[PDB]
Write a protein that binds this ligand. Structure first.
Ligand SMILES: O=P(O)(O)O[C@H]1[C@H](OP(=O)(O)O)[C@@H](OP(=O)(O)O)[C@H](OP(=O)(O)O)[C@@H](OP(=O)(O)O)[C@H]1OP(=O)(O)O
Ligand SMILES: [Zn+2]
Ligand SMILES: [Zn+2]
Ligand SMILES: [Zn+2]
Ligand SMILES: [Zn+2]
Ligand SMILES: [Zn+2]
Ligand SMILES: [Zn+2]
Lengths: 193, 83, 91, 255, 145, 156, 264, 41, 330, 103, 48, 117
């Protein structure tokens, strides 16, 4: 609905939450459809949740047994970096990914002692904790982000955006203030006004 | 830019002359108003766009007000029939 | 690349084909007008081609105001074409 | 009388038309309920449904609930709820105009809120400034499927269909402009008849064209502009003076 | 991306798959009486099948005049597989294309894993419990079955 | 109801003798679940009213059987409550004086009404009738928005 | 923030009205700017919900109710009010309304009353206006169709006629007044009138209705002392009877006019 | 050259005062240093 | 109110619960060759023999069925008198020894073609609107009804009057049925604005046909090339659809020009494939080219011609009839 | 040039759009304000002319040629009492400018 | 979507070979596929 | 003034509401579409609540209390997964031992494919 209200029907959202263009886009279409990190973070979190829910659905259909389910949940939580692409819009999630990798190492080398290689390790509780504690701090950020986006959708954009003095604007603003200073001095001292 | 202005006036005079021909042919087409570039754009003929009336002073203006109204409506009838 | 070769991409053309099949949608301005009118059988689509001739003569007549001779020639030729379309839907 | 019978169900719930309009683009927009990616083909179509006042009128829940407003879909000849409808299923009459006489300044007889300015199209609900009683009737060629018909014959058709829908002041047909003007006694009947006759055909069952009546575009019924005829203008001034003199009586007797 | 779609331009992947499927079918025809085959059927497979990388179907389906003795699954170049174990009258050939990389260009491991994965789903991909998967690696130009 | 699982214990004796009635209630609810794709808001509300009625009626079956007919053991009643064939908290309302025929719990949730009142369907019909007569009209209330109930005062 | 401006006729006669306030809930119908919406019902069980359509500063600018836009002293619409005042004042005043949206927003914020509002916004002026108002109340194919029209024959008892021809119709007369007076005479009827022709035709449901019509008083019919004249039209009529174009209708009207002036 | 101009007057802040805020949550306007210090006296 | 009066008031509610109501209410053809003396009150169904058309089967009003020869005498061989109501549909089983008959009497009867013997008879709870049978099996038949069910029968089965299965995915009355010429799948159309394709003896439709502007389709048939099928929609246009496993419509195969609405007009195909035909309410026997949907001609044959049928070998020959009773041959 | 009232309306729309655009982009050009007001005096629409002079005064009330133009414009069209109100206002806001007193 | 998107959406029924064959049939009737020149941006190679 | 606890609805009611909001083409769904877009800011909270209540390997089917908007816009899992820490440790230790034994004993462990659908 957010895609369609913005008129971007030339973008399609898969039922596994990939966003793909339906056609090669014009430049005006590309500028008009340039969705931001708020949308994409939301989309990829839905994608992650979709993967987890789909494994439970597979278990409940009888397609995979409980051990396969445990291993699947563990694999998803360890391989968010490959399955989800969420780092592209929030690169600080690499801490979570790195923590999951470290946890996988210590869990495996406790688990696989005298077993050897191959799938089967379903002890998914630590990585699960990592991602929940990430969601803790991601809730206020995404609430602010998505709120501002949807506010722009309904209320529209503020008329009076005051640009700050960043270093790209520094010299121009210096010139304006210097010019005004010279003009104030000379128009004050001239007798004829 | 002056080339663009020339072309714009060419298109305007095209519409004007075509409207005049059709008026001589007895099919009275109305002139097309310009398209609004944005939803809140202004047509300056519909209203006195930001009317700031003179603040009323001590002297009565009524007689010369109705005289000015007479003058304006006379001019309007004149341009209607004489062009 | 430009708008034109994006619009003439295989995906866009296939979507146009699917839309004219699935819902009857066809932007006639994309397509070359029939030279011979009599091969057109529907009153609806013949009238739509007539509309194309109409918007064409409007856009040409905007440019009439070598130039006058060639554009007058094309203008009266398009009026001949318009006559043929009106004749065809009238018969 | 319509009071003697319960209202007929005009159209069954399963017989109602789809909400998705005819395709005019490549993709259906789930927000706007309209087609995106291109805009080609006309959006007008002939209504499958038409009101039949003597047949379809009758009592509803609205008469028992003390309702004021008329059913929009009854006028369109496609009300699904029939006697269970909250809204009134009959042609407006002086009783109901009297009941509407407070709300009528800012509301339609259908209970829709009026606007300050008319649409540029002169379509839609109408202005609370004007209190217009006159409908423009265009698209008459499409309403007849381009059938050739004499002007008095067209006028007789327009006279028949609009006179079912209220008390009428004037009907005139203009051959040169190929358009009709219908003026009602009450603005509520003009409001009603506009929605009742919008997108309809003028064809008859007796016509040879009747079996393909759905193919074109129907009647184009809009609010009329002020009549530029000087006779009509001085008539308008006379009735304005009469309305003013009648109102002086009320102001004086109240104060 | 540009270089690899330039190599695989004009649907070369599907062309490779179709041509190899046809080659295996057309040489199985020349041994129909030798292998006691009642019929060799090239399957009308969905167009995305050639690059459907998580699912599969039979490319060729093959009927027996009288039932075959078949081995437990084994690679193309293993020699001691014995036919006494199992009996069947229908078999399939599945042709899988891959584009390998430095981590994975042991096509034998790929075909073994894909076979044991696909043939043991809850929902059966194939028209019979017995068959052969053939694999071709396009990046490294290798084959196994 | 709650899906059968290792979590759940087997049904006590007597569940087999009431199972046909419960299964038909299940059948009706399975039918009512579906996307019938109603176009109108009014008829879309009516389809939720159907579900609320079915919920009420199955709970009334179990309620009358246990508390009034006394044809059901405490063990079987506890099992039906635990597996949620019956609404626990609505049955708790039917046990109270003045609520013996209550339709649903939302219609007495005073803290979410605009005026802080109950739903109008809990007014006795005679009171609405005499108010309408004193005003000089028929009664305008037909069905309440929450569940489609037409009146569930215990006098009615 | 000013209080809502709602008239008693909107509020009704119940002793207490509950009203719901919604800050910035609605956009004003006159000026498009947001405002505090009020909405209420006249009683709890009334089924229509009344809401403020215009903001308070637009309402005070015009001296009107926010819920029905009638004048908050005289309970009449702006056009009729400004017309009434401009009969008592020689110099006309009218409510000039903005058409551009920026001018709509601009006009609403200037705190100056508009049109007839100031003349009605205090009792002294409004009472003076009504005192003066009391003084005001104290003070070409015609040659063919004229044989299709029944003009040679007369209003009679004996011939059973279901259809009639009407002429000397003044253009002021609406169609409904004609049907209404025939309804009064019959104690209750397809009518065609062409006002550019100044004539028309009346067709009854069955012959006994036409006979009852001719039973009550070439004949005459009265509409506010306009003397519509009436003739039995045995030959059936249609809309074509009065001419196929506007010019034919006008020519027919002049012909009928000179025929009337001869008859009188 | 006419796109490229000096500043004759600056934009007046009175224009921004003429209409209401539109509810965008800026990060720098989130709560912070919520208690004022006061001096000894 | 007294308690007794409240008790009586409770009993007046239309319902035994809180939802009880208080409410008040309680090649090209050219010209006609001959005509047979069909049913005087009107013919409602016609059929040629399926593989070789030497005989014409007829049913209509006057509650009777009759069979005529197409050569050498042009006379009725025999009549079948066993119906109480007008014949709705007739269908020769795919082995010519028998034909199915349905009528508005809610009775479906299968008759021996050569002897005129009722092989079996079915009584139904709803009016049948079509009867059809498998190309692979003469004993198997199917019946579409007004109550939106489709009953399936094999006459060898005695259990439950031979009802082998029932289909349910239709919200209103069935109007037409047709097997694929292979007979493994069948098609059905409904009063509900949709058509379905079904696996034989399976209660799940393998495809659904729907569009935002689709009208109902009271008749359906297969083109002799069998790659395509066709139906007469109430839009006064005939439509054609693929029988290939995609089952999608084909875009330019629209067939307009005939007044169909409110009548069960039939559509028929030339045996060479290349031409198609339909009736009309005002008796114009229309024809079209199948290759390009181009119009061919109409004949003003002596009234609604609801039935048409085309001979499997006699090129340019077609039969028609309707309420006029007489059965005209071109 | 112009043969019809509708054509006059088109001309007036174009010129008004031009002048209003420039005065939107740069309001401090007092000469531009003056000649826009002069344009509306040429159209004989004194309400518009008065409004433009008033807006120009709101941009800068201290600029004496703008006051003199407005006063002279009122007097040129015989609107003496308007001019009297205007001159009284002029001296009332700028009492130390000799030119307004002399005018 | 970004400039360097890897994937475009194909409908589930999309056969690429049939799509190209249909688009080839369509290409012979489109105006801008059959006009006689290609628009380009270029520098003037010499003074003229 | 006075409080009573939130009524718990039949689950079929919520199920119906999600089913009916499948297409949302009719004009009756405009307010619902707006509610859907306003729900979007609360999705990460709902995602946290769902994943937080995820079934552990030893339980087949976890019934959870939910809070849902009557437009169908969003469903929150409205409960906290409280556990007894020595019991939770014992449960996960049993799960650990069982999974170890299964990796040992199962000749071929067939992993899932991702995305599963
Ligand atoms: O890159 P790592 O984090 O270390 O993990 C690698 C694998 O993960 P992926 O690269 O995603 O496939 C993992 O299998 P998975 O987790 O997928 O089930 C293997 O575990 P095992 O074979 O099942 O025991 C590891 O083998 P060990 O080295 O014995 O830990 C392997 O390490 P390696 O890359 O050094 O060989
Ligand atoms: Zn209704
Ligand atoms: Zn209740
Ligand atoms: Zn309830
Ligand atoms: Zn209730
Ligand atoms: Zn306002
Ligand atoms: Zn009011």
């Amino acid at each position: 609905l957010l895609i369609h209200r913005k008129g971007l029907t030339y973008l399609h959202l898969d039922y596994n939450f990939n966003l793909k263009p339906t056609k090669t886009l014009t430049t005006k279409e590309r500028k008009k459809s340039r969705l931001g990190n708020s949308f994409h973070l939301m989309r990829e979190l839905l994608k992650m949740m979709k993967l987890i829910v789909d494994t439970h659905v597979q278990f409940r259909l009888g397609n995979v047994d409980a051990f396969q389910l445990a291993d699947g949940i563990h694999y998803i939580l360890n391989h968010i970096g490959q399955l989800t692409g969420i780092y592209r819009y929030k690169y600080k999630v690499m801490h979570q990914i790195r923590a999951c990798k470290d946890l996988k190492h210590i869990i495996y080398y406790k688990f696989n002692k005298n077993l050897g290689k191959g799938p089967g390790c379903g002890f998914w509780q630590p990585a699960w904790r990592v991602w929940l504690n990430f969601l803790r701090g991601t809730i206020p950020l995404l609430e602010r982000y998505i709120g501002n986006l949807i506010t722009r959708q309904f209320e529209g954009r503020s008329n009076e955006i005051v640009k700050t003095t960043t270093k790209q604007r520094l010299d121009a603003y210096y010139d304006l203030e210097l010019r005004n200073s010279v003009m104030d001095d000379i128009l004050e001292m001239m007798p004829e006004s | 830019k002056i080339r663009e202005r020339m072309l714009e006036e060419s298109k305007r005079i095209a519409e004007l002359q075509k409207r005049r021909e059709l008026k001589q042919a007895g099919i009275n087409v109305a002139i097309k108003k310009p398209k609004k570039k944005y939803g809140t754009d202004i047509d300056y003929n519909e209203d006195i766009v930001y009317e700031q009336a003179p603040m009323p002073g001590i002297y009565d203006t009524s007689t010369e007000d109705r005289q000015i109204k007479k003058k304006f409506e006379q001019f309007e009838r004149k341009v209607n029939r004489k062009g | 690349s430009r708008n034109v070769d994006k619009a003439n991409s295989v995906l866009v053309r296939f979507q146009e084909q699917q839309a004219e099949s699935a819902g009857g949608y066809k932007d006639y301005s994309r397509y070359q007008r029939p030279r011979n009118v009599s091969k057109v059988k529907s009153i609806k689509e013949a009238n739509e081609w007539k509309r194309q001739v109409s918007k064409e003569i409007k856009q040409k007549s905007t440019r009439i105001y070598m130039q006058i001779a060639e554009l007058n020639d094309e203008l009266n030729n398009l009026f001949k074409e318009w006559k043929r379309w009106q004749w065809h839907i009238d018969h | 009388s319509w009071r003697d019978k319960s209202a007929k169900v005009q159209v069954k719930e399963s017989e109602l038309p789809s909400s998705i309009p005819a395709q005019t683009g490549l993709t259906f927009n789930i927000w706007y309920n309209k087609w995106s990616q291109g805009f080609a083909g006309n959006t007008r179509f002939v209504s499958p449904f038409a009101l039949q006042p003597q047949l379809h009128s009758g009592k509803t829940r609205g008469d028992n609930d003390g309702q004021l407003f008329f059913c929009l879909f009854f006028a369109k000849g496609m009300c699904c709820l029939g006697p269970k409808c909250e809204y009134l299923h009959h042609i407006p009459d002086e009783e109901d105009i009297g009941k509407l006489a407070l709300r009528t300044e800012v509301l339609d007889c259908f209970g829709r809120e009026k606007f300050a300015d008319y649409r540029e199209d002169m379509g839609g609900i109408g202005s609370f400034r004007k209190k217009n009683k006159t409908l423009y009737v265009g698209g008459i060629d499409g309403a007849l499927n381009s059938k050739h018909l004499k002007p008095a014959q067209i006028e007789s058709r327009i006279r028949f269909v609009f006179s079912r829908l209220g008390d009428i002041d004037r009907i005139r047909y203009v051959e040169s402009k190929n358009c009709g003007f219908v003026k009602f006694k009450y603005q509520a009947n003009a409001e009603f008849a506009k929605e009742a006759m919008s997108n309809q055909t003028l064809l008859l069952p007796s016509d040879k064209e009747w079996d393909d009546r759905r193919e074109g575009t129907g009647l184009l019924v809009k609010w009329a502009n002020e009549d530029p005829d000087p006779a009509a203008q001085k008539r308008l001034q006379e009735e304005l003076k009469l309305e003013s003199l009648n109102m002086m009586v009320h102001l004086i007797n109240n104060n | 991306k540009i270089s690899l779609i330039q190599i695989f331009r004009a649907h070369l992947w599907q062309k490779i798959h179709e041509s190899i499927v046809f080659d295996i079918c057309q040489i199985l025809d020349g041994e129909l009486d030798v292998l006691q085959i009642e019929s060799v059927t090239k399957e009308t497979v969905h167009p995305r099948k050639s690059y459907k990388m998580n699912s599969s179907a039979a490319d060729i389906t093959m009927e027996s005049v009288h039932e075959w003795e078949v081995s437990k699954p084994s690679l193309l170049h293993e020699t001691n597989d014995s036919f006494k174990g199992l009996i069947t009258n229908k078999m399939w050939f599945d042709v899988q294309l891959r584009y390998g990389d430095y981590d994975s260009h042991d096509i034998s491991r790929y075909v073994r894993a894909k076979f044991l994965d696909y043939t043991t789903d809850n929902v059966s991909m194939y028209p019979s419990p017995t068959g052969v998967m053939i694999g071709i690696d396009l990046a490294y130009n290798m084959y196994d079955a | 109801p709650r899906i059968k699982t290792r979590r759940s214990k087997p049904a006590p004796d007597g569940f087999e003798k009431i199972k046909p009635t419960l299964t038909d209630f299940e059948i009706q609810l399975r039918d009512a679940q579906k996307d019938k794709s109603s176009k109108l808001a009014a008829k879309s509300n009516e389809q939720l009213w159907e579900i609320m009625q079915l919920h009420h009626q199955r709970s009334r079956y179990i309620y009358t059987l246990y508390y009034k007919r006394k044809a059901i053991s405490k063990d079987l009643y506890d099992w039906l409550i635990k597996e949620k064939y019956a609404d626990k908290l609505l049955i708790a309302k039917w046990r109270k004086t003045g609520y013996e025929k209550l339709c649903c719990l939302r219609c007495i949730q005073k803290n979410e009404t605009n005026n802080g009142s109950t739903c109008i369907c809990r007014v006795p019909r005679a009171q609405l009738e005499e108010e309408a007569r004193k005003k000089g009209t028929q009664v305008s209330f037909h069905q309440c928005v929450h569940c489609g109930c037409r009146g569930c005062a215990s006098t009615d | 923030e000013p209080p809502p401006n709602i008239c008693e006729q909107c509020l009704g006669d119940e002793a207490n009205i509950r009203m719901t306030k919604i800050p910035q809930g609605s956009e004003c119908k006159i000026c498009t700017l947001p405002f505090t919406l009020y909405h209420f019902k006249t009683s709890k069980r009334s089924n229509n919900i009344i809401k403020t359509l215009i903001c308070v500063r637009c309402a005070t600018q015009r001296n009107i109710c926010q819920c029905c836009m009638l004048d908050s002293r005289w309970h009449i619409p702006i056009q009729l009010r400004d017309h009434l005042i401009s009969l008592v004042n020689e110099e006309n005043v009218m409510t000039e309304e903005a058409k551009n949206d920026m001018m709509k927003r601009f006009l609403s914020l200037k705190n100056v009353k508009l049109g007839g509002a100031q003349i009605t916004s205090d009792p002294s002026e409004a009472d003076n206006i009504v005192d003066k108002l009391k003084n005001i109340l104290l003070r070409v194919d015609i040659s063919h169709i004229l044989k299709k029209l029944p003009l040679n024959e007369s209003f009679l008892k004996n011939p059973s006629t279901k259809s009639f021809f009407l002429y000397n119709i003044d253009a002021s007369i609406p169609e409904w007044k004609i049907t209404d007076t025939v309804s009064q005479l019959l104690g209750i009827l397809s009518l065609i009138v062409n006002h550019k022709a100044k004539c028309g035709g009346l067709r009854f449901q069955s012959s006994e209705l036409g006979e009852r019509f001719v039973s009550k008083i070439r004949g005459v019919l009265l509409i506010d002392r306009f003397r519509i004249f009436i003739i039995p039209w045995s030959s059936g009529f249609s809309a074509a009877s009065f001419g196929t174009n506007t010019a034919e209708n006008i020519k027919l009207s002049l012909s009928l006019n000179k025929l009337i002036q001869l008859e009188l | 050259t006419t796109s490229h101009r000096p500043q004759l007057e600056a934009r007046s802040g009175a224009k921004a005062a003429a209409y209401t805020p539109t509810g965008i949550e800026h990060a720098r306007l989130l709560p912070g240093h919520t208690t004022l210090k006061y001096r000894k006296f | 109110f007294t308690k007794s009066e409240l008790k009586r008031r409770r009993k007046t509610r239309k319902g035994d619960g809180p939802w009880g109501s208080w409410s008040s209410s309680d090649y090209l053809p050219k010209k006609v060759i001959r005509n047979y003396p069909g049913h005087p009150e009107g013919t409602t169904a016609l059929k040629f023999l399926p593989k070789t058309g030497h005989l014409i089967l007829s049913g209509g009003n006057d509650h009777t069925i009759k069979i005529w020869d197409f050569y050498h005498d042009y006379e009725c061989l025999r009549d079948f008198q066993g119906h109480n109501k007008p014949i709705k549909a007739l269908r020769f089983t795919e082995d010519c020894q028998s034909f199915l008959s349905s009528s508005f009497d809610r009775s479906v009867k299968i008759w021996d073609t050569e002897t005129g013997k009722v092989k079996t008879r079915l009584h139904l709870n709803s009016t049948p609107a079509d009867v059809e049978s498998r190309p692979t099996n003469p004993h198997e038949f199917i019946v579409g009804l007004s109550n939106s069910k489709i009953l399936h029968y094999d006459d060898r089965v005695s259990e439950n009057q031979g009802l082998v299965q029932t289909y349910d995915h239709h919200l209103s009355s069935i109007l037409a049925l047709k097997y694929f010429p292979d007979g493994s799948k069948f098609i059905s159309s409904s009063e509900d604005k949709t058509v379905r394709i079904w696996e034989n003896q399976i209660n799940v439709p393998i495809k659904q046909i729907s569009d935002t502007a689709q009208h109902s389709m009271p008749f359906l048939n297969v083109h002799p090339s069998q790659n395509y099928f066709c139906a007469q929609s109430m839009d006064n246009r005939i439509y054609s659809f693929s029988l290939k496993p995609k089952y999608k419509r084909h875009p330019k195969k629209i067939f307009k020009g005939h007044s169909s609405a409110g009548y069960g007009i039939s559509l028929a195909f030339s045996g060479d494939g290349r031409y198609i035909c339909s009736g009309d309410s005002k008796s114009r026997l229309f024809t079209w080219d199948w290759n390009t949907s181009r119009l061919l001609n109409n004949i003003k044959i002596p009234k609604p011609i609801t039935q048409v049928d085309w001979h499997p070998q006699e090129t340019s020959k077609v039969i028609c009839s309707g309420a006029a009773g007489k059965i005209y041959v071109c | 040039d112009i043969l019809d009232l509708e054509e006059l309306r088109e001309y007036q729309r174009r010129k008004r759009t031009e002048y209003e655009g420039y005065l939107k982009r740069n309001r401090l050009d007092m000469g531009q304000w003056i000649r826009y007001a002069q344009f509306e005096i040429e159209q004989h629409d004194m309400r518009r002319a008065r409004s433009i002079f008033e807006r120009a005064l709101l941009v800068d009330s201290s600029f004496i040629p703008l006051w003199i133009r407005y006063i002279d414009a009122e007097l040129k069209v015989k609107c003496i009492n308007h001019a009297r109100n205007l001159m009284n206002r002029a001296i009332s806001t700028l009492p130390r400018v000799d030119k307004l007193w002399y005018k | 979507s970004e400039r360097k998107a890897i994937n475009k959406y194909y409908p589930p029924d999309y056969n690429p070979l049939e799509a190209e064959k249909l688009s080839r049939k369509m290409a012979k009737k489109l105006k801008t596929m059959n006009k006689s020149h290609a628009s380009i941006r270029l520098m003037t190679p010499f003074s003229m | 003034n006075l409080y009573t606890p939130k009524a718990e609805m039949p689950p079929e009611h919520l199920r119906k509401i999600i089913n009916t909001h499948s297409d949302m083409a009719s004009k009756m769904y405009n307010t619902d579409k707006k509610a859907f877009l306003g729900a979007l800011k609360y999705l990460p909270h709902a995602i946290l609540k769902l994943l937080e209540n995820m079934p552990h390997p030893w339980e087949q089917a976890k019934e959870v209390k939910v809070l849902y908007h009557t437009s169908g816009a969003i469903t929150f899992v409205n409960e906290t997964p409280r556990v007894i820490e020595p019991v939770y440790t014992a449960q996960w230790s049993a799960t650990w031992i069982a999974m170890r034994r299964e990796k040992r004993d199962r000749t071929h462990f067939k992993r899932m494919r991702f995305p599963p659908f």
